[PDB]
Enzyme design. Sequence first.
Site, mmCIF file in Angstrom:
data_model
loop_
_atom_site.group_PDB
_atom_site.id
_atom_site.type_symbol
_atom_site.label_atom_id
_atom_site.label_comp_id
_atom_site.label_asym_id
_atom_site.label_seq_id
_atom_site.Cartn_x
_atom_site.Cartn_y
_atom_site.Cartn_z
ATOM 1 N N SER A 14 -11.344 -23.260 36.519
ATOM 2 C CA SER A 14 -12.459 -23.981 35.925
ATOM 3 C C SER A 14 -12.855 -25.130 36.838
ATOM 4 O O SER A 14 -12.164 -25.451 37.811
ATOM 5 C CB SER A 14 -12.104 -24.504 34.533
ATOM 6 O OG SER A 14 -11.132 -25.535 34.616
ATOM 7 N N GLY A 16 -16.534 -28.078 37.635
ATOM 8 C CA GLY A 16 -17.936 -28.391 37.418
ATOM 9 C C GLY A 16 -18.843 -27.177 37.474
ATOM 10 O O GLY A 16 -19.932 -27.196 36.890
ATOM 11 N N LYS A 35 -16.974 -15.345 32.848
ATOM 12 C CA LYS A 35 -17.374 -16.604 33.468
ATOM 13 C C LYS A 35 -18.475 -17.250 32.637
ATOM 14 O O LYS A 35 -19.485 -16.607 32.328
ATOM 15 C CB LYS A 35 -17.854 -16.384 34.908
ATOM 16 C CG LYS A 35 -18.336 -17.656 35.608
ATOM 17 C CD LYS A 35 -18.699 -17.390 37.061
ATOM 18 C CE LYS A 35 -19.072 -18.684 37.777
ATOM 19 N NZ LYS A 35 -19.384 -18.471 39.211
ATOM 20 N N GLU A 89 -15.667 -7.648 37.090
ATOM 21 C CA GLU A 89 -14.460 -6.863 37.313
ATOM 22 C C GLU A 89 -13.248 -7.772 37.451
ATOM 23 O O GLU A 89 -13.342 -8.906 37.930
ATOM 24 C CB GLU A 89 -14.584 -6.022 38.583
ATOM 25 C CG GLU A 89 -15.564 -4.869 38.534
ATOM 26 C CD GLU A 89 -15.536 -4.072 39.829
ATOM 27 O OE1 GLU A 89 -15.752 -4.675 40.908
ATOM 28 O OE2 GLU A 89 -15.267 -2.853 39.770
ATOM 29 N N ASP A 135 -19.824 -19.583 50.597
ATOM 30 C CA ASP A 135 -18.558 -20.246 50.284
ATOM 31 C C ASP A 135 -17.390 -19.308 50.578
ATOM 32 O O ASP A 135 -16.458 -19.178 49.777
ATOM 33 C CB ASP A 135 -18.523 -20.742 48.831
ATOM 34 C CG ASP A 135 -17.443 -21.814 48.585
ATOM 35 O OD1 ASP A 135 -16.911 -22.396 49.565
ATOM 36 O OD2 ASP A 135 -17.116 -22.076 47.398
HETATM 37 C C1 LIG Z 1 -15.855 -20.065 40.577
HETATM 38 N N1 LIG Z 1 -15.639 -18.648 40.253
HETATM 39 N N2 LIG Z 1 -16.614 -17.745 39.834
HETATM 40 C C2 LIG Z 1 -16.059 -16.571 39.639
HETATM 41 C C3 LIG Z 1 -14.704 -16.681 39.970
HETATM 42 N N3 LIG Z 1 -13.685 -15.716 39.849
HETATM 43 C C4 LIG Z 1 -13.874 -14.419 39.532
HETATM 44 O O1 LIG Z 1 -14.989 -13.943 39.392
HETATM 45 C C5 LIG Z 1 -12.656 -13.631 39.334
HETATM 46 N N4 LIG Z 1 -11.448 -14.183 39.509
HETATM 47 C C6 LIG Z 1 -10.403 -13.445 39.289
HETATM 48 C C7 LIG Z 1 -8.988 -13.880 39.469
HETATM 49 C C8 LIG Z 1 -8.645 -14.948 40.317
HETATM 50 F F1 LIG Z 1 -9.607 -15.626 40.975
HETATM 51 C C9 LIG Z 1 -7.322 -15.333 40.476
HETATM 52 C C10 LIG Z 1 -6.313 -14.658 39.802
HETATM 53 C C11 LIG Z 1 -6.636 -13.593 38.980
HETATM 54 C C12 LIG Z 1 -7.954 -13.205 38.809
HETATM 55 F F2 LIG Z 1 -8.258 -12.167 38.003
HETATM 56 S S1 LIG Z 1 -10.953 -11.860 38.729
HETATM 57 C C13 LIG Z 1 -12.638 -12.336 38.862
HETATM 58 N N5 LIG Z 1 -13.726 -11.534 38.573
HETATM 59 C C14 LIG Z 1 -14.455 -17.975 40.310
HETATM 60 N N6 LIG Z 1 -13.194 -18.439 40.702
HETATM 61 C C15 LIG Z 1 -13.194 -18.974 42.047
HETATM 62 C C16 LIG Z 1 -11.836 -19.507 42.538
HETATM 63 C C17 LIG Z 1 -10.658 -18.664 42.003
HETATM 64 N N7 LIG Z 1 -9.561 -18.764 42.986
HETATM 65 C C18 LIG Z 1 -10.170 -19.126 40.653
HETATM 66 F F3 LIG Z 1 -8.903 -18.548 40.450
HETATM 67 C C19 LIG Z 1 -11.132 -18.701 39.523
HETATM 68 C C20 LIG Z 1 -12.462 -19.270 39.723
#
Ligand SMILES: Cn1ncc(NC(=O)c2nc(-c3c(F)cccc3F)sc2N)c1N1CC[C@@H](N)[C@H](F)CC1
Length: 273
Positions: A14, A16, A35, A89, A135
């Site tokens: 999570s 901003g 999300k 996904e 990014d």
């Molecule tokens: C900002 N933002 N917008 C979309 C997403 N993340 C995804 O979309 C996404 N993350 C998944 C995930 C993961 F990331 C880590 C462990 C297990 C998982 F299943 S599965 C999926 N579809 C994010 N992350 C960006 C940084 C990320 N390191 C954070 F852990 C989560 C925020």
Amino acid sequence: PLESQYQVGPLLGSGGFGSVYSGIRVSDNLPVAIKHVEKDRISDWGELPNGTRVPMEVVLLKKVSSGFSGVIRLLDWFERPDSFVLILERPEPVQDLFDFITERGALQEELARSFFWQVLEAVRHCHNCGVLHRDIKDENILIDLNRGELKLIDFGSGALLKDTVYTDFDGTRVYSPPEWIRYHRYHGRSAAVWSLGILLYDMVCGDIPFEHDEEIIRGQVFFRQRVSSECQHLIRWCLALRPSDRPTFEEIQNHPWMQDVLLPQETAEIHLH
Ligand SMILES: Cn1ncc(NC(=O)c2nc(-c3c(F)cccc3F)sc2N)c1N1CC[C@@H](N)[C@H](F)CC1
């Protein structure tokens, strides 16, 4: 809809930007990620074909979600009074590359080669679909641990790809190129290659090369870990100060260090299982 189609699990991350939860599609039950983005927080807005006002992130995700598994695909989305909700996904088991490098330290070059190659193919896919991620970094790369496949996440800082200068930026500053630091101007593809050089250094050294603006602008790369001369050369090429001195994607993938990459399943069997 919509709390009836998915069972919601624990927070994954999570900030901003919004909040991303683990989830399950009730009827599969497909592992998903849910999300939430507050409208008040959305900086970049886009338009759908039918003329709907929507976060640009939704526009970019739709453009890249064709099927190529190098990008986490957008499965559905909803608008709420004060927010948008994206269904994405979720590979299981999965770990993001930031956590992976944290647990394992600097990666062996055979493994970094396979990961870096897959990121290049994913970024090439985005650009082919008219999308600039903006990014690229370990936090935004997921590893499918059974298949050895990497997937790009978080297009919340992205833009439509264009050939003229960008004057805005909202990605990660320590991954941003010296022309952004100095002039608040960059072109999409050469800025992407710079961030790829940071990513590659981080993979084989276990940490990023630059912390402060002055280090980014100086562009001197010191290696804190043993790294092959071929890999060092590729990294230093990607991190050329002048954008037009950086390699194209074709030049990166034709580099001597990038030859004989492992297949993803090979990568998993050797390095992940
Ligand atoms: C900002 N933002 N917008 C979309 C997403 N993340 C995804 O979309 C996404 N993350 C998944 C995930 C993961 F990331 C880590 C462990 C297990 C998982 F299943 S599965 C999926 N579809 C994010 N992350 C960006 C940084 C990320 N390191 C954070 F852990 C989560 C925020």
